[PDB]
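Task: complex structure prediction.
Instruction: return structure tokens for all chains below.
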Amino acid sequence: TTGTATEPFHGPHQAGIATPPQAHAVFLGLDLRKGTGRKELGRLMRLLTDDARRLTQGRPALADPEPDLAPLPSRLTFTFGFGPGLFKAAGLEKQRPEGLRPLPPFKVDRLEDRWSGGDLLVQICCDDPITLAHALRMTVKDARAFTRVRWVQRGFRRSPGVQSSGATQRNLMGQLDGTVNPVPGTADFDQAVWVQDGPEWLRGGTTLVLRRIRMELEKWDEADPAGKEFAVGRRLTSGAPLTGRHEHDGPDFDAVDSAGFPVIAENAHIRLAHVDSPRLRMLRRPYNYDEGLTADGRSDAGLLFAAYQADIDRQFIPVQRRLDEGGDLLNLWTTPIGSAVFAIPPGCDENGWIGQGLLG
Amino acid sequence: QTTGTATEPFHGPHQAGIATPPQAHAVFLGLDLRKGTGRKELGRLMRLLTDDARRLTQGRPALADPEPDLAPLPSRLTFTFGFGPGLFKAAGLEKQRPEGLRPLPPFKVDRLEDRWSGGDLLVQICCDDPITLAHALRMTVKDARAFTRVRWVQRGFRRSPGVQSSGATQRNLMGQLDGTVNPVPGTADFDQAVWVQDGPEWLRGGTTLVLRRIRMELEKWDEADPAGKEFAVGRRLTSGAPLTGRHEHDGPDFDAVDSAGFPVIAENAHIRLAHVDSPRLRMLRRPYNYDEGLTADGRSDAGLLFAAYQADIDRQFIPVQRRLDEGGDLLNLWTTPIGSAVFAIPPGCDENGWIGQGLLG
Ligand code: HEM
Ligand code: HEM
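Output:
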């Protein structure tokens, strides 16, 4: 049984980033109350740090309302992120990374305030949804005095044990999603993900772009099946690029067909999204969402697109701009409806707290 | 075999999803019939839904599946179909409606909402994997959409597969072990309690389902005295033992008194008011937990999808629910029914039949 497994909470980095993605996630987006300044932010982060320090190791939080739900931690992780408004309220505008600001507008955007923005992120991931529900309850108990809930975004992947560790999993459009990604334990991953420039407090942390993207599954089902593969540039069942045979073959963007036209379309998703230099890649760590049905049977489902990178301006915005300006074929069936950005501090040890180097 | 490749048989004398040890995830899909959906249309629908379930539960794509790659990894997927009271009117088969198939009478604790209540047709889908479940739900809707409107969709969860040993009792979102006293599948008392053997012929080998969405007032629960929380139920939180005993499965001693001469298990303790002596009159509780979103000041929207299966609602559910209500169950201070629905669940089918054929055929 796997309920007893844990992920380390202490370290140079926060967990939940390089951690192989767990089956369940909640992204909790918080807005600061009017009186919540730097002093209050420190009191809040010390509370939340200790909650996570205990719950992730299967121990009840201080003042835990339901201690019996804290055993079976099931690889629970907490990742805390600071939005642009956090630096304003703390009086630390000098410490805000230049690129930490709301993303520029893109033509595909249909963004809603109720899924965008936020001053404080608590990302909670877990292989078990009861442990996750309890961890969310404790977080809100300790954050209530300082913050309002702006949004809560719940997502899922495969249950633990359904697929072998590391195997690519499918999204709700049926596509293998995650083939091209930096790999933890390599020098390229560290360069792509962990901050080493900019303000000193953020070194060893990262940045997160969180976009709620709706899937138009009505239109998608009507779509030509060959057209669906052409829009991505990979086959549905195998995940292979249209130029190859296996999932992990390298897409050949110079290949043309017997008529002279590119095998992978000039506006195929993976052509527009691709970056040559592995150290400029973003870490994609997405979750799926599925939420209820209209009377006439229309789904409300999509992707919680979570991208981690050392530099938003150098690693996320150029890709998103190419998808938009290049007219990504996948845009016919996907729609961004929420967008938020966060600076994720480095980790801490037993005698520290998350954000201490910024707020202390 | 893995958690993803494991299957549950679809064919049998009974529908799966009842005696099946509860899987990690569930969705209860509640449907209303459209105006033109009569007996003929219901037969076409039930044949479509049966064949989709027959395929998907075994890891094969449904007929005309728009996302066939999501159908492998069935992860113990089961479907359970149920017929609400309004179904028999639309089919012209009022004579075949069981006397006891009707909306529950009102109870003082009820704060029922229409958006969580009623329904002509139930599709209960359970699965160890949420992606497989999501795909199965979409295939169900794809085939039912022409004949029905969606009245509600209620999603719930238990522990992930492999988190606890199988058969071990699991906790609810109040932290309580939930499911200790239950008919055990594969026993004679289970068959007597669950499977219908009287009434209209088509329902023999089926059961009845009471589905109640019960909100947990977790703000009040947190402020509650911890001794009072155990006292309200009659069992200890950590061990799950009755207050009169030491281990989870010890029989509660309803005659024991404390040093003051008062019952150790209170007169209005949940397990005292809910208890029935005859094991063959017990209900099968197969609940799921739900947790859906937060107010701006951090108040939870969480509770229990209370799913009770029994041969006879009038003999096995209503008297218990009435004792809880009139007896003033201490647990009522922290729980609120906000939805209620009742369904007749037909017997199973074979490789050539379809669910409901004995009624709609
Ligand atoms: C619902 C929305 C989206 C869906 C369904 C989707 C789907 C996919 C699929 C199927 C692949 C190919 C397999 C893989 O390598 O993971 C892929 C690759 C990729 N996607 Fe997306 N994607 C979405 C949104 C985005 C967005 C908004 C970005 C913004 C930067 C993005 C960036 C990438 C990148 C960088 C790759 C790897 C490309 C390569 O170098 O081969 N995706 N996506
Ligand atoms: C959110 C609402 C409810 C909660 C949290 C809850 C909780 C519990 C708990 C902790 C137990 C003891 C452990 C066990 O045997 O499972 C129990 C037992 C039981 N509950 Fe509930 N319950 C709820 C609603 C109901 C309702 C509405 C009924 C209506 C029939 C019911 C019927 C029973 C029965 C029959 C037992 C077994 C009692 C025995 O014979 O020992 N429960 N419940």
